[PDB]
Amino acid sequence: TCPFYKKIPGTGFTVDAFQYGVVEGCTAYFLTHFHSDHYAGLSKHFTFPVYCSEITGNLLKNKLHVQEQYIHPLPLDTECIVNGVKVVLLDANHCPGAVMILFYLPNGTVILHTGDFRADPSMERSLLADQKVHMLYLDTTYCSPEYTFPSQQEVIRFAINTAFEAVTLNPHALVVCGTYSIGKEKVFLAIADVLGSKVGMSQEKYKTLQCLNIPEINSLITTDMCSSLVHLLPMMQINFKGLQSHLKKCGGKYNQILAFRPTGWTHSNKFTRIADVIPQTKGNISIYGIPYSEHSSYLEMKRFVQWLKPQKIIPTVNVGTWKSRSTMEKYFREWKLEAGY
Ligand code: NI
Numbered sequence: 001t002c003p004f005y006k007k008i009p010g011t012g013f014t015v016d017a018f019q020y021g022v023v024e025g026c027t028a029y030f031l032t033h034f035h036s037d038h039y040a041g042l043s044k045h046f047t048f049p050v051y052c053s054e055i056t057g058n059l060l061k062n063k064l065h066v067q068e069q070y071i072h073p074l075p076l077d078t079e080c081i082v083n084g085v086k087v088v089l090l091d092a093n094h095c096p097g098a099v100m101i102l103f104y105l106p107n108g109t110v111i112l113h114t115g116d117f118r119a120d121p122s123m124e125r126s127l128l129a130d131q132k133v134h135m136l137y138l139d140t141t142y143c144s145p146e147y148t149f150p151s152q153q154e155v156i157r158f159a160i161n162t163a164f165e166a167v168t169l170n171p172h173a174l175v176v177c178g179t180y181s182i183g184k185e186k187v188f189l190a191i192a193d194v195l196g197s198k199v200g201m202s203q204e205k206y207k208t209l210q211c212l213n214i215p216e217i218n219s220l221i222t223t224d225m226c227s228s229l230v231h232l233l234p235m236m237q238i239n240f241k242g243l244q245s246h247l248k249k250c251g252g253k254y255n256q257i258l259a260f261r262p263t264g265w266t267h268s269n270k271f272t273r274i275a276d277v278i279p280q281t282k283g284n285i286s287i288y289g290i291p292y293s294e295h296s297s298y299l300e301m302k303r304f305v306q307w308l309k310p311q312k313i314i315p316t317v318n319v320g321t322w323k324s325r326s327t328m329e330k331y332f333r334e335w336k337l338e339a340g341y
Helices: 054-062 121-125 152-169 185-195 203-210 240-248 298-308 322-339
Strands: 013-015 028-030 050-052 071-073 080-082 085-091 099-104 110-113 135-138 173-179 230-234 256-263 280-282 285-291 312-315
Touching: 050 054, 054 071, 054 203, 121 298, 135 298, 152 173, 152 185, 152 256, 152 285, 173 185, 173 240, 185 230, 185 256, 230 240, 240 256, 240 285, 298 322, 312 322
Parallel strands: 013 028, 028 050, 050 071, 110 135, 135 312, 173 230, 173 256, 256 285
Antiparallel strands: 080 085, 085 099, 099 110, 280 285
């Protein structure tokens, strides 16, 4: 059964609610982004209207085979009427195709659902500038002050400089980057661009990338692994055994691997600056964990919420324990007392 924080009162709508069967009263199912915890339940047999971005619609059609007649793509930054209710989709600064949804309820209430997001000051000049929000359904993944990490630009600067140094010292080194979902594509794209290479990958991953509307993608990626010195592999293979096994397959073209594991936050963020990060090394294999986040830091989140000044907040992440729920409610009250709303 569908939980309360996935329902939008006063409408026939749900958000990210595909794993509960037929939801009573639902006339349109919204999908914020193509991550498995959110799409869990969709397939070619789904027969209700799905509302989403163009990019999410490309992924639903090609990767999950949802039939075309049930896919409803909406443009961003544009007022749209869905089943008699005005909605807007906004870029969430998460993975490709990810949106926040603004719902203008028939009684005058305005609701923002963030989906998964990485808050940014640029959001303070979207269509959110223009009006009040009564209810915020908030991505609270990192809602505690211990969660710190650098900007995505600092993290990419570190990766490009690390890869370019290593391959200039050794032209026979291969670079490998782990992946397990869409998102974080700048990691492997920026490294391949500095090296003058296409990115090599499996047919399955190439298919996924081809749904993303990335400009000039045909110039950047390939399934011909032999022509490429940046390879993508499943995240589960980014370990000494998996990488050893991979280097055997490369026909004596390479004599070293440098690998990157993009993660979210890890506790080593509580001690070590990005500049000071070192790899784990065994023999001719080195592995860097790099903290490339597609979710708000605590400070980014707080800034956004103090600017928006919502009347009520409903968290959408970390809702399963009393301790998590209590901690989050405490911070919402500080923020409100500090800013005066
Ligand atoms: Ni996500």
